[PDB]
Curated annotation (Swiss-Prot):
Name used for this protein in its record: Protein unc-80 homolog
Shown residues in whole-protein numbering: 2628 to 2909 of 3258
Organism (species): Homo sapiens (Human)
General function of this protein: Auxiliary subunit of the NALCN sodium channel complex, a voltage-gated ion channel responsible for the resting Na(+) permeability that controls neuronal excitability. Activated by neuropeptides substance P, neurotensin, and extracellular Ca(2+) that regulates neuronal excitability by controlling the sizes of NALCN-dependent sodium-leak current. UNC80 is essential for NALCN sensitivity to extracellular Ca(2+).
Cellular compartments annotated: Cell membrane
Disease: Hypotonia, infantile, with psychomotor retardation and characteristic facies 2: An autosomal recessive, neurodegenerative disease characterized by severe truncal hypotonia since birth or early infancy, progressive peripheral spasticity, and profound psychomotor developmental delay. Some patients may have seizures.
Gene name, Swiss-Prot/TrEMBL: UNC80
């Protein structure tokens, strides 16, 4: 059925209609995901994400168009994953607002944790693109949240960031309020890992909802 063109239009207006409660947003994103899966060459994911890159309402787009797609689909191909990753990370490091930066950080975390099987081909690459945010301190407080979450779960990114997170990051205001927390959690203490991505998805959905009422 997917190849028939008349269906494509129905999706477009539908996603346009999105910017609805959770039961409708989940269904729309599910339909988009199935459409991407069915047709890859003719309808790559790039088309539906390209027009909303401009800083007009991209915060809401990232909040309720990208996070649901990744959450509900977390067989996608490598190049589309690369395009999605570079698009999301562009916001943090332009080649700016606090809320859109937080949304982009959330997208970065979800992408990092879900696609651990295929993304790990370029861990070093990401470990190179992840220094600058801490170097120039983009984002008010979400940066510390990201770093402390990484330290807590300490996924393969933690493999490369251990030297940069101790020597060049340790050496008085609200920024340091939680600094002791992350520093303590960076110590070689007992490490209770999450059982599976399903457990983390609960907190992911909770924080997604909270950010939704935040807007």
């Amino acid at each position: 059925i997917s190849f028939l063109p008349h269906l494509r239009s129905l999706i477009n207006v539908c996603v346009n209609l999105v910017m609805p409660p959770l039961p409708f947003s989940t269904a729309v994103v599910r339909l988009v995901a199935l459409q991407i899966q069915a047709l890859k060459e003719d309808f790559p994911l790039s088309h539906v994400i390209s027009p909303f890159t401009n800083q007009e309402r991209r915060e809401g787009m990232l909040l309720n168009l990208l996070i649901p797609f990744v959450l509900t689909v977390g067989w996608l191909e490598q190049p589309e994953v690369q395009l999605l990753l570079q698009t999301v990370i562009n916001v943090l490091l332009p080649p700016l607002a606090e809320s859109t930066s937080q949304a982009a950080y959330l997208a970065l975390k979800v992408i990092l944790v879900c696609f651990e099987r295929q993304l790990g081909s370029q861990w070093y690459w990401l470990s190179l693109q992840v220094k600058e945010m801490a170097l120039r301190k983009v984002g008010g407080l979400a940066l510390w949240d990201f770093l402390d979450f990484i330290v807590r779960t300490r996924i393969p990114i933690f493999v490369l960031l251990r030297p940069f997170i101790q020597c060049k990051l340790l050496a008085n205001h609200e920024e340091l309020s939680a600094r002791q927390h992350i520093a303590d959690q960076l110590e070689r203490r007992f490490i209770p890992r999450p059982l599976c991505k399903s457990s983390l998805i609960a907190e992911f959905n909770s924080e997604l909802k909270i950010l939704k009422e935040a807007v």
